[PDB]
Design a protein around this ligand. Structure first.
Ligand SMILES: [K+]
Ligand SMILES: [K+]
Lengths: 181, 180
């Protein structure tokens, strides 16, 4: 029933690439909410990541943090996570957001066909682009913003500018607490 | 000799793509300033200049250059840079272009004389090397595929533009009813 977007990631740190995708999909598909789902890490503390995530999202009631993947140590197969969430929120239609580059590879995901019954995949395409896939997925066109957590971590380490890449508030948190040096 | 960046465009509207590039090049090459150089139903010059102002008001080292606007009709880059080098003889101009454009430099009007007037700065995606016969500087910048025309289309379709251009510029747009 209720349409909720899911966006996974390390959020280490969270950045404007996350916010942009969350906002676009939120509007394109007319979602009720978008949940940011912090993954485990393949190191910044979990608390630090959640506080940055909180600062990143504090300004929009429709963005929320989901801790499911954290109540269990080690890597989670997306299927396990989504199984738990559908179990917990039976009246929610989950929209699992993925990059268009990822769409090609979906057949390689653990338990992909059972996973397809749990969620609606949303692929992010560059404007003007059609995604090629055997599976029935939704496409949302979004200008490419090639920023990533790891790129930002490098930069902070090299004392290089990050202006415009992640929220001013998260930057302050980072500098204040001396993350990524 | 002062190092000044030049970034050309319609700025119709100006957006975070512009600011991002300007900031990256400013820091990468340790420039003194970056000048935004506006090109010549169409938005008024004054509207464009005003948005450009709002977009850049917060950084003393971003400035607006009116050279191309002071000549009615379009201006080859060579003509513009010739004028600027005349007026600012002690400036080393860093003309900023997209990596995709680097391929097509040999096709520019008077490219060879132009090379003596400016240092080209090509914007590359991280990890990629630009291929060109000419001696240019490379700055790596994460791709932000936003453009004025994309934004104009978005506004006409009453579609969200959050995170794509500065709030001050959005507000300006909604208040002067631009792009509907
Ligand atoms: K919130
Ligand atoms: K300024």
């Amino acid at each position: 029933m209720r349409k909720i977007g899911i966006i996974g990631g390390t959020f280490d740190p969270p950045h404007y690439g996350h916010l942009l995708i969350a906002n676009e999909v939120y509007h394109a598909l007319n979602l009720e909410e978008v949940w940011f789902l912090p993954n485990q890490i393949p190191i910044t503390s979990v608390e630090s990541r959640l506080q940055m995530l909180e600062l990143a999202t504090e300004a929009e009631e429709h963005f929320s943090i989901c801790l499911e993947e954290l109540s269990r140590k080690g890597p989670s197969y997306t299927y396990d996570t989504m199984l738990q969430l559908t179990k917990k929120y039976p009246d929610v239609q989950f929209h699992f957001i993925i990059g268009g580059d990822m769409v090609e590879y979906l057949p390689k995901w653990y338990n992909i066909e059972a996973l397809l019954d749990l969620v609606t995949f949303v692929g992010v395409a560059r404007p003007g682009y059609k995604l090629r896939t055997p599976y029935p997925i939704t496409t949302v066109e979004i200008p490419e913003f090639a920023v990533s957590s790891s790129l930002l971590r490098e930069r902070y380490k090299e004392k290089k500018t990050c202006k415009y890449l992640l929220p001013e508030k998260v930057q302050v948190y980072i500098e204040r607490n001396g993350l990524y040096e």
